[PDB]
Point group: C2
Chain length 621, copies 2
């Protein structure tokens, strides 16, 4: 069986037993993260050792631990006590969320703030939000959550329509104390509802949409073996799932004649951050590391056939751990299917008389997650021509505030008195490269304009240049859309039939990167988001661009610390980290529920093949 | 009958008859362009006057004429003789293309050049290409085509595999004279074939692709009336076709409650240019304006069901003129259909308990043209949420040359000895805007970064700014991907319920623009392509960014001449001209037939609606 297979319920049960038995899972303990470790470099020819990594919280205040377990052998390999003030706090527990609202509900300062605004405490929902690190000395080493209030008029009401501005609270979810309640002044609570299933708002549902039926009478063209191994139109890969990262692709390879050719060893979205750009002290601390602080995998939706995923769908149902180490299945959490993708190649030739058309298609691997008000879909695409693409789809309900009477340079008006603070959604794709194997390098390619003159008398010439990134200190790069800048990953020791190194070219969307001031806390904690492309030398323990414990960690962790090692990356085992994001100035059309917007990137073969790899695609019926 | 209906065969025949009756279409005359004119501003209530514009060429060398005819009234409205040396030659006639190879076959200089290379003239194809304007004074006022040679080994051979470098000829297609044959020396003619239907090159065809069936059991959701009027999911528009521009969209509007709200009055691709970046004298003159010089509409393919267009397809079969004024149908030249487009909106709310998912779809209107080795697809999309998008798809066989022994800074190697000169494919979308009517303005929107300090103590704030373009002199704009630059077209006299002007936001891909030296002929002739965005005041005779007559025409017409008028565009009837293109450094993967690559743009509503316009979409089955 493959060492890249999905974790089983039984494996999670075994982990639980090992911990309990070792005295590491007492009643005050909680599992904040649990996931299988990938195989070490060079092991496929050694006996498998399924290992799991676990972060263990203690609700009684004791120090948390990082533990590594071997389920194959039934042992604890390592258990280290964590100093959270130094290395960071553990991810937020799903169970700690409800705690903010409950604690506030009996706090005199909070109740006084609600009384001033004539709000029934029973109707006030509180969003349990990550704290970050600012000027509050007493917070260092404490697990803090901050809370913003929203009014829910009735059980099925959308509370996002009714933010309570001018009020914020801080809570210690371990000592269960309210550390601060800040009331900067009363703002009107927006009164219009945002109930998008209410006929009064939707009006009569349209009856004009006729069905579109998408079927595959002989079934799908892909095969799934060993639970999660996919083969499709020359492509080979394994679909992993981790509670923090979500869907992870392993061993992406392409079968070129009689050779299975590696392209990417591991692909994942290794972090994603949502920084807010409203300077009000009510929200100025607001930055959500959806991946690193909340763990997007654990909140993956069950995807419904015909609504979420359309066509001939093959599902995976990944298993994760709950807080106590019990296995929990996410039914139909991953969708797999192939889609038509228009014309692949076409030419009608006058001279030969040959008219030729071929159709394209893509393999899709997706999941969808919900984090409070946001919902994000993560889509990986494999195309017939060798192209690999990622796309994030952002939807959900916008995070809201009051709209100030005088207007705002940092907030949009969505409805009367209803504001939506400006923010970004910024992702980091970690691509552990393996172009024809692990000996890889990256070049930055810019188009080069040429001056009219000798050797270019008509002034029509243009060219391009490539710069090898040889050391990590030179490998922090920025976009330059104006010069058509891309990055090529190649294997200097593997050449195509024209004697050029095989390569793949990364095409970025060139959206803005992190907008915050460089001296800001968020710029330090999300340093990765300040630049478009980073290249590091592969290492076991360098997994996330923000480090292992993002919650309430002071800046510098992750990429900035990795890069500081200044390792050789010229013809070596390397990792590309691409930052890409949406900058969101919410529009009226985003309310009361927002239409999907998208961002992503793709990689196209660049002299990887000896000619088109789709000449053997047959004519369509 | 709608004044925006497609031209009928009868109308074209009637234009022929009116021209003949007027003495303007004798046996030496040829129609180089013929198209219906759009209704004048403010004519909606006035009765139908269908008028046609015609460019008439004379094969005896007399001066050509531009003529406008009223087919309704049976009259010549205007007829003027053209001085082509000044204002430009007429578009290339389909009949002139074949003249080049025919004449060269008997030219002693051409025969000697072929003999030097041991090539059989009977097997030498000549690509007949637009000439542009260079240092050859004898070409001024003459209709010239330039020819580049390719060997075709047998009737079904792809000649593009066998370019004959070091050789080019110039031909006067009216006097039937070879004006120049330039031979800069013998290059090896690449020997490998590029026959993508030959089993020896394709290998065994895949048997792994299972069928994807897309059907609509109740038929499509759009209706077609009056021949070309489309209504679909609140959208209303008319699909026109013009021999020069191809598919043209008219009267794009969206039904919002009771009101039919205009958005775009006319959308077209008003020019495209393909400049080559190889400084070899054999190709340094090489640029074509497929739209302006060749007329892309006339080379539209007939699109095959299940191959070119998949699903429930409604076709239009537009009619054009032949060279003598006889009508000719392009059977199935335009495909129209709707397609699923993933998730439209989705939110699973913990507090309300409501899980909500809706699906997206788009209406597609497309055609595909073939000119020489190139094949271009033009796709317009309308989305449920009010988004409008255009996409160009480039495929075909790349234009080849020899690959120089020492390598090249301006040409890629595709196969042994076979090169592909660098080039661009650049489009101009002309958007005659009508956001809620004709009173419009354009603002450039940039993200604004803020400095940490008073009022922004945590350094998280970010903002944006909008700059109104008030006069044509300040309306020639460039991309700035780094600052998230977009352009908003708004109506300052039509406000949403929040008292803000309704608008649409143009999102560009921010690809490189024209790379040629600003001193080059191509930079003058394709001036529009040097900047990303232009805004003009609407005028009847301002149709193309390159002017009416592009063939062998120097600078002096088109956008730079229009802009000089410095007209008020702040709350006026305005037109947006957006430049966007591909910069193509050909890859081995592009050979022997290239996979589709794409480029485009879209516009999204920006406070146009008072809330999401898709709340009335029903749950899918
Ligand atoms: Br315990
Ligand atoms: Br209340
Ligand atoms: Br999907
Ligand atoms: Br910090
Ligand atoms: Br005549
Ligand atoms: Br020959
Ligand atoms: Br289509
Ligand atoms: Br010129
Ligand atoms: Cu957002
Ligand atoms: Cu090209
Ligand atoms: K065991
Ligand atoms: K008539
Ligand atoms: Na690697
Ligand atoms: Na206009």
């Amino acid at each position: 069986a493959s060492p890249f297979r999905l974790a089983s319920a039984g494996e999670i049960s075994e982990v639980q037993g090992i911990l309990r038995t070792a005295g590491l899972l007492g009643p005050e303990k909680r599992i904040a993260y649990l996931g299988v470790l990938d195989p070490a470099r060079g092991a496929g020819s050694e006996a498998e050792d399924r290992r799991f990594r676990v972060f263990i919280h203690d609700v009684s205040g004791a120090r948390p631990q990082e533990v590594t377990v071997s389920v194959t052998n039934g042992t604890v390999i390592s258990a280290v006590e964590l100093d959270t003030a130094a290395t960071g706090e553990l991810p937020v527990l799903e169970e700690e969320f409800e705690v903010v609202e409950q604690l506030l509900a009996t706090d005199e300062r909070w109740l006084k703030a609600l009384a001033a605004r004539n709000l029934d405490v029973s109707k006030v929902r509180v969003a349990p939000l990550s704290a970050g690190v600012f000027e509050y000395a007493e917070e260092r080493g404490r697990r803090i959550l901050r809370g913003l209030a929203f009014v829910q008029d009735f059980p099925e009401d959308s509370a996002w329509a009714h933010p309570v501005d001018g009020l914020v609270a801080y809570v210690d979810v371990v000592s269960k104390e309210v550390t601060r309640v800040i009331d900067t002044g009363v703002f009107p609570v927006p009164a219009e509802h945002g109930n998008y299933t209410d006929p009064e708002l939707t009006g009569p549902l349209r009856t004009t949409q006729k069905p579109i039926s998408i079927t595959q009478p002989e079934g799908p063209s892909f095969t799934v073996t060993g639970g999660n191994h996919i083969e499709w139109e020359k492509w080979s890969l394994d679909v992993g799932f981790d509670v923090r990262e979500g869907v992870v692709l392993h061993n992406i390879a392409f079968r070129d004649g009689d050779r299975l050719r590696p392209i990417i060893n591991r692909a994942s979205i290794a972090e994603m951050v949502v920084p807010y750009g409203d300077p009000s002290p009510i929200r100025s601390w607001q930055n959500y590391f959806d991946t690193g602080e909340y763990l997007v995998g654990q909140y993956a939706n069950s995807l419904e056939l015909g609504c979420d995923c359309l066509g001939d769908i093959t599902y995976l149902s990944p298993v994760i751990s709950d807080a106590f180490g019990n296995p929990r299945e996410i039914r139909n959490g991953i969708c797999m299917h192939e889609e038509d993708w228009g014309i692949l190649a076409k030419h009608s030739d006058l001279w030969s008389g040959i008219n030729y058309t071929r159709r394209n298609r893509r393999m899709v691997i997706s999941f969808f997650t919900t984090i409070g008000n946001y919902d994000y879909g993560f889509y990986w695409y494999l195309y017939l021509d060798g192209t690999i693409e990622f796309e994030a789809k952002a939807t959900g309900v916008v995070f809201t505030s009051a709209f100030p009477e005088g207007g705002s340079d940092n907030i949009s008006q969505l409805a009367p008195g209803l504001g939506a603070p400006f923010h970004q959604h910024i992702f980091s794709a970690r691509l552990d490269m393996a172009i024809d194997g692990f000996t890889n390098r990256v070049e930055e390619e810019d188009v080069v304009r040429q001056t009219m003159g000798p050797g270019n008398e008509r002034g029509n010439a243009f060219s391009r240049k490539r710069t090898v990134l040889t050391r990590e200190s030179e490998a922090v790069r920025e976009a330059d859309a104006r010069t058509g800048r891309t990055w090529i990953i190649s294997n200097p020791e593997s050449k195509n039939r024209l004697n050029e190194p095989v390569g793949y070219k990364l095409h970025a969307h060139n959206q803005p990167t992190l907008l915050a001031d460089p001296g800001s806390s968020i710029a330090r904690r999300a340093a990765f988001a300040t630049k478009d492309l980073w290249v590091t030398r592969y290492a076991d323990d360098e997994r996330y661009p923000t480090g292992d414990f993002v919650n309430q960690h002071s800046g510098g962790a992750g990429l900035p610390s990795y890069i500081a090692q200044d390792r050789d990356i010229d013809g070596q085992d390397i990792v590309v980290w691409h930052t890409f994001g949406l900058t969101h100035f919410p529009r009226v059309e985003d309310w009361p529920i927002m239409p999907v917007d998208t961002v992503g990137f793709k990689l196209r073969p660049e002299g990887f093949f000896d000619r088109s790899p789709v000449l053997d695609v047959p004519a369509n019926p």
